[PDB]
Symmetry: D2
């Protein structure tokens, strides 16, 4: 819809996603050869957003295991899509690593990514 | 990573029913606590991912999932993601932090996202 | 030092701070007449940062009560100062409102502010 | 807002000793859990703010504070802020979420900040 396609964040990463008609998000995420760096993503979005000019709520997850590498971690992005001539997906994210119990307190990093339709 | 499929309950009275696929998929349903309302009216689709080959040094299993708060009955114009780890054994837990983003106008975007933490156990 | 002075974020807010020699931060925060909008801030920073080009860790708190208004809430900013010709204070923040027990789950909002030495 | 001054303990074995001033100041010390180390080597200055006139409808008292992890003995080149609310009565609590930012190079800034939650009680 407005979401399906390729998106680029400030870090050099690339997000390719299909938004299904009833709320599914499926795709690949490439962190900053390209194929070693590509990971599955899945998520959900609001397939009927409000009609008052509000953004479209959405989230997705990447677990950082593919056929080549396993970082033993997962990131979730939570945010909203904003359409128009300067379309954005504005997110906050949580990256949790698998840890022992003694290290669990420091298992989760937090940050923010802004995605645009063109590269920075 | 073994150990995730099944029913989980958090401190808020929510129920999380998930299947963990062999290659890292999470699929299932998430139900909010109800008192007056019938259960299925507050049941929502979830999807996510988990580490299907965790380190076998006693570390937890990294995972995450998303609920968009739209179903056939209700739409809150919002989405939550949970990020955390599964810890196995006799008192198994899924320990998470979450981000809840509401769809807002640009002027309200700064206040769009709530943060919290949910601890899931196998008993209510 | 590099921190003391006036800082401006993307939202229209103004942060005026003094960094004391041993780690104190004291000042006023003005959210976007000016005086009704001004609140006390206090915090801490690393008064001896690493010498490898790293930023300077710091945090502060504003409780949103002044002589005129009380929102029954408090924000903390956590971040790092980065000096040089384009100096920044890059932060993530948590805004917690006072709530009943039943509403506590939704008490805390999270976001990010980037502060510069000139207005946006 | 009354009720905050004194000693508080979290689930990680840390000790938080704070004075709440009449107009909203928080001042005190924060000590990490120790096993081999002497207590004062892991004790740090804190400052913060709280709502000194909370709503008297059973709501909690909003507050926050900061520790920069430098003392006369050690420097971790980091700072934590806790944001939360004091809840009074017989099982009094300070329920918080926290952000821990490490000083990093620009290339490492994306991974500079950890997030978590601490529950403080009046007993260990
Ligand atoms: O666990 C990992 C996997 C890679 C995560 C990439 C993050 S997802 C949030 C942000 N947005 C992006 O587009 N990319 C970044 N990496 C990792 C974790 C910790 C450390 N470490 O040194 O501590 C090094 C690499
Ligand atoms: O947008 C919503 C949808 C419901 C979210 C439930 C949250 S997901 C994190 C946490 N864990 C759970 O199991 N349940 C809670 N609800 C909502 C949002 C805002 C307000 N509000 O008053 O602002 C009221 C309800
Ligand atoms: O409790 C409040 C007090 C004002 C907080 C301003 C925030 S601090 C993080 C960010 N950085 C800034 O420079 N300014 C913003 N406001 C408030 C809270 C909730 C609602 N609400 O409608 O839900 C309205 C106002
Ligand atoms: O930077 C530090 C300083 C110590 C922070 C203690 C945290 S504050 C939140 C939580 N609540 C507590 O009472 N204690 C913990 N430590 C540190 C940072 C990174 C790593 N690391 O391995 O990456 C190890 C130690």
């Amino acid at each position: 819809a407005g979401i399906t396609g390729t998106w680029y964040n400030q870090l050099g990463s690339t997000f390719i996603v299909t938004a299904g008609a009833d709320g599914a998000l499926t795709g690949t995420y490439e962190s900053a050869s390209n194929e070693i760096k590509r990971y599955v993503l899945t998520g959900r979005y609001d397939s009927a957003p409000a009609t008052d000019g509000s953004g479209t709520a959405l989230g997705w997850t990447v677990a950082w295991k593919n056929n080549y590498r396993n970082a033993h971690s997962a990131t979730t992005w939570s945010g909203q899509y904003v359409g128009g001539a300067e379309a954005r997906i504005n997110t906050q994210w949580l990256l949790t690593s698998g840890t022992t119990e003694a290290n669990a307190w420091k298992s989760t990093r937090v940050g923010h990514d802004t995605f645009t339709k063109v590269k920075p």
